Ligand binder design. Structure first.
Ligand SMILES: [Zn+2]
Ligand SMILES: [Zn+2]
Ligand SMILES: [Zn+2]
Ligand SMILES: [Zn+2]
Lengths: 96, 73
DNA sequence: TTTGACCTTCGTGACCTA
DNA sequence: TTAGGTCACGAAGGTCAA
């Protein structure tokens, strides 16, 4: 796409786009699990730590909120349904 | 390596490499808010062998080496 | 009544197929 | 192109035999 391989959550090296925002392979994994599990993080501090390639894992609540602000959408996360389905059709078409 | 008693380090814990011992002693300490008093000069030497000599100085070092209290649950 | 070796969870992220 | 699946690793918890 030509836009900088830099994660907008933690400044780490981004491997591209994930759920609609340029992110590292780690924050991607995070953002999804977060939504899929419906987690409720709460930042000990005054809700405003700075996410960095190194501290990130420190305050989840802020990471998540940050993921969300740079635009990542849950919309892009396949439902449980969708998955089972595809997984099946494909698997059946293994029929040899 | 445990930055506290020196003994082998299971890995980081509440922010600092540390043996299993210094982990439990630091958990228990917090979860129970125990408070120790130093028997001497408050600069006792803490190591594998004599890490139980003075609870005050042990715990105290833990903080000193950077162990966090809010890291405990 | 404290220890601390051991064990149980579970969130992580680097890698990989598609 | 990105999606989900892997899964080997922490790091927090906990257990109980001394
Ligand atoms: Zn990131
Ligand atoms: Zn925060
Ligand atoms: Zn130690
Ligand atoms: Zn002492």
């Amino acid at each position: 796409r030509n836009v900088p391989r830099i994660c907008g959550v933690c400044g780490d090296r981004a491997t591209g786009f994930h759920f609609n925002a340029m992110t590292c392979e780690g924050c991607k994994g995070f953002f999804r699990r977060s939504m899929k599990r419906k987690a409720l993080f709460t930042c000990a501090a005054n809700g405003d730590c700075r996410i960095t390639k190194d501290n990130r894992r420190a305050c989840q609540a802020c990471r998540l909120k940050r993921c969300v602000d740079i635009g990542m959408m849950k919309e892009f996360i396949l439902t449980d349904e969708e998955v089972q389905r595809k997984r099946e059709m494909i698997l059946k078409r293994k029929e040899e | 390596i445990c930055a506290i008693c020196g003994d082998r380090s299971s890995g980081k814990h509440y922010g600092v490499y540390s043996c299993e011992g210094c982990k439990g002693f630091f958990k228990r300490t917090v979860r129970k808010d125990l408070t120790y008093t130093c028997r001497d000069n408050k600069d006792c030497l803490i190591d594998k062998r004599q890490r139980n000599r003075c609870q005050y100085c042990r715990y105290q070092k833990c903080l000193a080496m950077g162990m966090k209290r809010e890291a405990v649950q």
